């Protein structure tokens, strides 16, 4: 595998134009296949050494008609010109024609059966006005050759065969045609005896698909990583992905898809699905940024952003507007752009907030505050003078890694008095909490501004079971529920780490007992359809491949594959 204009496969076009009298073309000695066309024009060397060149495909052609273009390889004065076109193994041309003209000193081109090399019947073959004083081919070559040698003979292969083998055959007999994965002719009936591959190549055996990474294991009636697991590197199957290249399930792509992320489980980098929104870091505000605050000109650059490499400053200047009427006020609806933000490396500074927005439910998906960058006098979270905020609303906030916490002058803020910051603020609390002069605790309790009864002794981020730090029982979509759908209801659910999850499909709702035990289909009371081993599938293996080939089995009476 190598780019166009050493290796074995030439991905691209082999172009050699205007070369001196002597050139180290010995690097081209090892070339088997060319994907494009061969361009040799206006050269001065005597020989083009491509002895292993067996197949020139021709997905694209020079002059819109030629897979091999050779001309003007001589000089009007000097005596240095192309004399030999060493293509001793040139067998097939899948597409395109041949153009060899105006080569004054090039011999043995008017003796080659190009109709045997060219597969495209409608292609144009022009070979004339070449060498004049050319000696006959060697007695071995039997008339057709590439040069004056016993090893420079053209090997004929193509032969009109039975209609059972449409073109692709190795003889006139019907029991001698090629394989279905052969691009042209062949040598034998086997898959390891072809000239060129129609798709891929394991190690000389042309297969339509490289060894799948996930094959069927006879042991555990399911799927498992395959021993070979060769990945697609374009035309060559490789067990290990190339340099920097990431494994995209079945292909070795240069970079992961827009809907997938570059995960790295079993050593190598693999492109796994994001499952929602892909992680994305963004520039923030504060010391080291471009801005003093977020505003009308910054709010648009936070779309689909999950991580904040920096901080987020919310000043009155950003909300109300610029003092010099340069930048208009910030539309409160655009604040919903931070709903994708999960982590902030630095601090969060909210000194201003839209009056009709009584909380920070915009940051309801905010999980982690690093505090690797602090504000003012060592603060990671500063909410000051917000006379409209009734509750915080950081339902997803579980960790504030460092720094102090400043929450004051909010006057109408509640639901935060019962919060156990130790279960959120990492490191000894000591004197890191600066929370005072908000809404009096007695005022909140009197008006019922406290945590929902379904919340534990931890605390809350506002009213309702959704703003709880820790549920007394279970959680469902971030909502504290008393029971999961264990014995009744749809969908039937199970429990894990005090959180509700739906049971795997094809598992009928078992009344009275638990339907599922885990997330997979390996853990059910019974199957709603079929049961291939210790599993529960909607259909028995119709045509899945394992380590040997396709695997299938009829539903043995009691629905057991």
């Amino acid at each position, epitope marked *: 595998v190598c780019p166009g204009t050493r290796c074995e496969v030439v991905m691209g076009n082999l172009e050699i134009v205007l070369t001196g009298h002597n050139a180290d073309l010995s690097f081209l000695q090892w070339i088997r296949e060319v994907t494009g066309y061969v361009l040799v024009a206006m050269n001065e060397f005597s020989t083009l050494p491509l002895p292993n060149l067996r197949v020139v495909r021709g997905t694209q052609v020079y002059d819109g008609k030629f897979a091999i273009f050779v001309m003007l390889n001589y000089n009007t004065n000097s005596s240095h010109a192309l004399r030999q076109l060493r293509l001793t193994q040139l067998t097939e041309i899948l597409s395109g024609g041949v153009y060899i003209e105006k080569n004054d000193k090039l011999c043995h081109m008017d003796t080659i059966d190009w109709r045997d090399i060219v597969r495209d019947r409608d292609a144009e073959i022009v070979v004339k006005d070449n060498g004049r004083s050319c000696p006959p081919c060697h007695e071995v070559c039997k008339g057709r050759c590439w040069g004056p040698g016993s090893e420079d003979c053209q090997t004929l292969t193509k032969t009109i065969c039975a209609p059972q083998c449409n073109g692709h055959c190795f003889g006139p007999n019907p029991n001698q045609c090629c394989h279905d994965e052969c691009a042209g002719g062949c040598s034998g009936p086997q898959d390891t005896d072809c000239f060129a591959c129609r798709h891929f190549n394991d190690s000389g055996a042309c297969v339509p698909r490289c060894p799948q990474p996930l094959v069927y294991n006879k042991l555990t009636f399911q799927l498992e990583p395959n021993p070979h697991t060769k990945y697609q590197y374009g035309g060559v199957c490789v067990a290990s992905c190339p340099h*920097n290249f990431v494994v995209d399930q079945t292909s070795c792509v240069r*970079a992961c898809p827009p809907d997938k*992320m*570059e*995960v*790295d489980k079993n050593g190598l*980098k693999m492109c796994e699905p994001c499952g929602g929104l892909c*992680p994305k*870091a963004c520039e923030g505000t504060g*010391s*080291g940024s471009r801005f003093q605050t977020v505003d009308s000109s910054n709010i648009d650059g936070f779309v689909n952003c999950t*991580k904040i*490499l*920096g901080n987020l400053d919310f000043l009155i200047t950003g909300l109300n507007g610029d003092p010099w009427h340069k930048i208009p006020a910030l539309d409160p609806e655009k604040l919903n752009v931070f709903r994708t933000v999960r982590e902030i*490396t630095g601090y969060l500074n909210i000194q201003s907030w839209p009056p009709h927005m009584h909380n920070f439910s915009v940051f309801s998906n905010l999980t982690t505050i690093g*505090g*690797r*960058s*602090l504000y003012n006098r*060592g603060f990671s979270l500063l909410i000051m003078k917000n006379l409209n905020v009734t509750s915080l609303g950081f339902r997803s906030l579980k960790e504030i*890694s*460092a*720094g102090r916490i400043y929450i004051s002058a909010n006057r109408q803020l509640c639901y935060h008095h019962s919060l156990n910051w130790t279960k959120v*603020l*990492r*490191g*000894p609390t*000591e004197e*890191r909490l600066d929370i005072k002069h908000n809404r009096p605790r007695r005022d909140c309790v009197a008006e019922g501004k406290v945590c929902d009864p379904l919340c534990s002794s931890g605390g809350c981020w506002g009213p309702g079971p959704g703003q709880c730090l820790s549920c007394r029982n279970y959680s469902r979509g971030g909502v504290c529920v008393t029971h999961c759908n264990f014995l009744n209801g749809e969908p039937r659910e199970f429990a894990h780490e005090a959180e509700c999850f739906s049971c795997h499909p094809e598992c009928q709702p078992m009344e009275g007992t638990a339907t599922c035990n885990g997330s997979g289909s390996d853990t059910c009371a019974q199957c709603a359809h079929f049961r291939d081993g210790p599993h529960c599938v909607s259909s028995c293996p119709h045509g899945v491949l394992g380590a040997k080939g396709p695997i299938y089995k009829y539903p043995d009476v009691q629905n057991e594959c």
Partner: antibody
Amino acid sequence: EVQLLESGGGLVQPGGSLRLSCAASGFTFSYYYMQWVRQAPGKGLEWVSYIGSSGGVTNYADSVKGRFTISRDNSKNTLYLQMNSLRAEDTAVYYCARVGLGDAFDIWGQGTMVTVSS
Amino acid sequence: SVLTQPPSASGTPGQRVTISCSGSLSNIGLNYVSWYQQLPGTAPKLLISRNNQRPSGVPDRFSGSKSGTSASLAISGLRSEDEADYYCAAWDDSPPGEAFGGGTKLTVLG
């Protein structure tokens, strides 16, 4: 001026223990995460551990996890590293670095060589 | 948890050399990239911070860049004082720590 001064290194035997000290000056030590990076003679830079500003988060390399323990005294402006059960492959030059803007190591120590030989 | 650098790099006084740095989404892909120069027999210092920033002392010759899960260090105008070890580093997420590079040994001929 702004300086991270290290100490506590020296020649020790396998199984032996050592406590490295890193005194800060010129800046507010309580506002930054602190790092430990060693470098074996011939080898490259190897991350050892780091600690939060308030001594909260603490993560180690798998090469030292369980044997080494990072801590800090913000009242005394000092970063510590409790190296216990020292192995021969722990022989290196232990630098203490401060995280800066953009999580970059802008301030390093002077060296303090730690040697573990039988 | 390591970044991938070329083990060696060479050039002549006045030539431009490049030092690439491979990584992953866990480290470089979601964090800033920083370069550190280490003169022989000395402690490493901050050469490049936050992908492309240079502190007061680093000339305009050095220039770092970041594109995806990889980063580069370009040194336009090589000098005999640039002969040192060059390490790249990036904060790592899923394994909480610092992802360092193997190290690049820049050799200035002349």
